[PDB]
């Protein structure tokens, strides 16, 4: 039968027993059964290179394409594997041909992943101004209605400047901070307004239900290596059949390109020589998660609940609060943010008008001068690795540090309590000016 | 004591199937057992400490592999980075070039260019909406070095005669099919004289021939470490002199290092371009070390494989009674791969007839002729036979009505392997003369 969750499940993984993994959402990790699968695929590749790599690669790709589309509840003709989420997002933006009038505009939110945000910048530079972009600022904790309204005002405002809102990139779950984004509402608005919905669901498969069919996005990308126990360097790229014709070239351009099984699926089979073993392990990771663990829903059910209750314990230990809106829809994933018990001094260049609640929440804590914010930020990162042998990413949002913790099926309440007590003393030492 | 002798005794150090004969190392390469173990050690370290290792040890390990490969190529370390493969870095060059506003820029390339790279030109023309064009330069092999230089000098001229401007030339170090050493020293020099960006595709390069980077001084060069440098698949070194690093505006794909308009920003840009297993990149310093301490260094490795390619190639040509692909100057087989014609002719195609050299018509009289339509049928048949029954693999170039089989020598091969290749290809070719491919 299935195995119980918690620290006993560390038996199945290959983490350092001295190292606490509180940040699975960044790079992921794989259990011992999947690494051996990974290395098994390599031995076959090095045993007879041309026979295996030329003819067994498409068979092993389609076995994982079938398993992942199955689990996503979508046709197999619509899923394909790319290197990673940054690669997939780049594949969408680099392939779109923009209107000849030059009125097209890319809409995005300021919680966009750094790599994604800078891809929009370069594409605008590369196409030399035939497409532009407008940034939608977000204040967190964000109410879902405020996010969708800020998107509607961006659509309305863009048209008042003579611009055409052409494409919108929507997170499933944002990176920093790790919050569930109301992507269903934003994608639906994109359809009504005829906007290409480029759903960046890197924090997606294996953690939250993507609801691909009912949402019907134009493009979706998601990192299997982030929450599906898939070896590093694997993202599932979803393109409906109606849109596969605009993905004209892969990244990079390879043999499958035709100058002007489907041709769309075949073009991604060989895109330059790479170790494709992480792709082949998708079918095993899915089968391992269903047989060894209780299944996909049981995995997500535990991680989300542990993120709530575990995050609330870190907040009690710190005397602060988790990051959540009035409807409790931000912590609908496996990650949770907790505010740290201090505050940064005001930036005279870009001062943030603090909200009355955010100011009473500052309640006379220790204040780090803004000139020392980056210095203390580096210190907390190094100390968490060198002294506590863990790693906690922190979002600097409105002169506060929001530490993001990632729950997993091999963690339990004791880990988040250790995380709370660790962060507690770490901030006590930040309060004493130890970062200098 | 001393280094290890070459030949089949060296297979103890590799992880090939003993029932499989790897006569085609040039396609995907392979790694020794010591390098595979290093690949898994980097893999083990990443899973033990995802964030601490991948965030902070990746800079260090990339820099050790950058210094190792830069010293091997005798190149400043500030001018080398690592990309995914040869196809990836050729795209990196062609997609960052800002073409001139009027639209006369054209990309020069030869028709023996690698298939992915030529189509990369076709897509860049499409994505840039016709402001850049291409001009294919046909080549006939056996090609003389003077004739290649002549075709390039006359293609530059026909361009400007049409009011066009040669902007960039895709130049091979060693071409894929047929596996042949290309006179890149002269074509790169002519690109400097004619103000043409030299984009060198040296995928067949590192670990096999002397790239002579400092001397020929190219604008951009790529080379597959995983092809001939015993590096795990998914690795290729990207050489750009710092005079041209500003031209690479964004990596492929675009990531944190891009900036809109100690370690240089160019070098920093290629460290994190998306979540990937970087174990192949880290092994570059381990492969170069292994090749030095165990095999005796690049120059002993390279010249053995080039010597074996000639002698073993003429054995296959002798066993089959044909010939090898070589020019009058003996400059085509200046690498580790050799092309030997198979003993039969393809019927002429009325859709594009091959008017052949007098000497070319004398080399095929008496040979069994296969009709042109059945050519692709027997081509697919020979591939399946050499794998399912002879348990090997040999790629074949179709060029002017004769198949040239491309063999790949390597430190773990010797003369008995090429004798087996010739013996295997006669059994194969005698069976296509009897029409077995039906």
Curated annotation (Swiss-Prot), chain A:
Its main location: cytoplasm. It is an enzyme of class 4 (lyase). The modification N6-(pyridoxal phosphate)lysine is found at residue 226. S-(hercyn-2-yl)-L-cysteine S-oxide binds at residues 26, 404. InterPro entries: Aminotrans_V_dom, PyrdxlP-dep_Trfase, PyrdxlP-dep_Trfase_major. One of its GO terms (cellular component) is nucleus. It comes from the Eukaryota. GO terms for molecular function: hercynylcysteine sulfoxide lyase activity (ergothioneine-forming). Its EC number is 4.4.1.-. Its cofactor is pyridoxal 5'-phosphate. The keyword Iron does not apply. It holds the Pfam family Aminotran_5. Pathway: Amino-acid biosynthesis; ergothioneine biosynthesis. Keywords: Cytoplasm, Lyase, Nucleus, Pyridoxal phosphate. It catalyses: S-(hercyn-2-yl)-L-cysteine S-oxide + AH2 + H(+) = ergothioneine + pyruvate + A + NH4(+). Ergothioneine (EGT) exhibits antioxidant, anti-inflammatory and cytoprotective properties, leading to its growing application in the pharmaceutical and cosmetic industries. Also shows UV and gamma radiation protection activities. Finally it acts as a cation chelator and a regulator of glycolytic metabolism. It is found in: Cytoplasm; Nucleus. The keyword Magnesium does not apply. Gene3D superfamilies: Type I PLP-dependent aspartate aminotransferase-like (Major domain). Belongs to the class-V pyridoxal-phosphate-dependent aminotransferase family. EgtE subfamily. Catalyzes the conversion of hercynylcysteine sulfoxide to ergothioneine (EGT) by cleaving the cysteine residue at the sulfur atom, the last step in the biosynthesis pathway of ergothioneine. Ergothioneine is an unusual thio-histidine betaine amino acid that acts as an antioxidant against peroxide in conidia and contributes to conidial longevity. PANTHER family: HERCYNYLCYSTEINE SULFOXIDE LYASE, L-CYSTEINE DESULFHYDRASE. This is Hercynylcysteine sulfoxide lyase. It comes from Neurospora crassa (strain ATCC 24698 / 74-OR23-1A / CBS 708.71 / DSM 1257 / FGSC 987).
Curated annotation (Swiss-Prot), chain B:
Belongs to the class-V pyridoxal-phosphate-dependent aminotransferase family. EgtE subfamily. Its main location: cytoplasm. It comes from the Eukaryota. The gene is egt-2. S-(hercyn-2-yl)-L-cysteine S-oxide binds at residues 27, 406. GO terms for cellular component: cytoplasm; nucleus. This is Hercynylcysteine sulfoxide lyase. GO terms for molecular function: hercynylcysteine sulfoxide lyase activity (ergothioneine-forming). Ergothioneine (EGT) exhibits antioxidant, anti-inflammatory and cytoprotective properties, leading to its growing application in the pharmaceutical and cosmetic industries. Also shows UV and gamma radiation protection activities. Finally it acts as a cation chelator and a regulator of glycolytic metabolism. It is found in: Cytoplasm; Nucleus. Its EC number is 4.4.1.-. It catalyses: S-(hercyn-2-yl)-L-cysteine S-oxide + AH2 + H(+) = ergothioneine + pyruvate + A + NH4(+). Keywords: Cytoplasm, Lyase, Nucleus, Pyridoxal phosphate. Its cofactor is pyridoxal 5'-phosphate.
């Amino acid at each position: 039968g299935p195995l119980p969750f918690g620290n006993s499940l560390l038996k199945e993984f290959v983490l350092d027993p001295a190292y606490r993994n509180l940040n699975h959402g960044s790079f992921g990790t794989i259990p011992s059964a999947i690494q051996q699968k990974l290395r098994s695929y390599q031995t076959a590749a090095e045993a007879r290179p041309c026979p295996f790599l030329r003819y067994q690669t498409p068979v092993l790709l389609d076995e994982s394409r079938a398993a992942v589309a199955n689990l996503l509840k979508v046709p197999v003709e619509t899923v394909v594997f790319v290197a990673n989420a940054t690669m997939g997002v780049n594949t969408v933006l680099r392939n779109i041909v923009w209107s000849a009038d030059g009125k097209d505009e890319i809409l995005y939110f300021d919680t966009i992943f750094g790599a994604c945000g800078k891809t929009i910048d370069y594409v605008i530079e590369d196409k030399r101004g035939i497409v532009s972009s407008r940034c939608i600022p977000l204040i967190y904790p964000a109410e879902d209605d405020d996010v969708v309204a800020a998107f509607r005002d961006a659509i309305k405002k863009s048209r008042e400047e003579g611009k055409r809102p052409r494409l919108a990139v929507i997170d499933v779950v944002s990176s920093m901070p790790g919050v569930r984004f109301p992507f269903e509402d934003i994608v639906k608005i994109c359809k009504e307004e005829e906007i290409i919905s480029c759903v960046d669901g890197a924090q997606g498969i294996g953690m939250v239900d993507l609801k691909i069919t009912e949402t019907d996005p134009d493009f979706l990308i998601s990192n299997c290596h982030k929450w599906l126990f898939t070896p590093r360097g694997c993202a599932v790229f979803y393109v409906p059949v109606r849109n596969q014709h605009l993905i004209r070239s892969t990244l990079p351009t390879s043999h499958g390109f035709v100058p002007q099984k489907s041709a769309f699926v075949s073009n991604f089979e060989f895109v330059g020589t790479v170790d494709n073993s992480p792709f082949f392990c998708v079918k095993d990771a899915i089968k391992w998660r269903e047989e060894v663990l209780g299944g996909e829903e049981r995995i997500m059910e535990y991680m989300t609940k542990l993120a709530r209750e575990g995050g609330q314990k870190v907040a009690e230990i710190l005397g602060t609060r988790v990051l959540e809106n009035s409807t409790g829809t931000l912590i609908r994933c496996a990650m949770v943010n907790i505010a740290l018990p201090f505050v940064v001094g005001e930036d005279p260049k870009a001062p943030v008008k603090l909200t009355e609640k955010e100011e009473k929440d500052v309640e006379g804590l220790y204040e780090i001068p803004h000139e020392e914010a980056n210095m203390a930020f580096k210190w907390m990162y190094n100390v968490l690795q060198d002294e506590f042998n863990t790693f906690v990413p922190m979002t600097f949002h409105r002169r506060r540090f929001w530490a993001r913790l990632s729950a997993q099926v091999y963690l339990e309440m004791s880990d988040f309590e250790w995380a709370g007590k660790t962060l507690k003393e770490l901030c006590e030492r930040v309060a004493k000016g130890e970062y200098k």
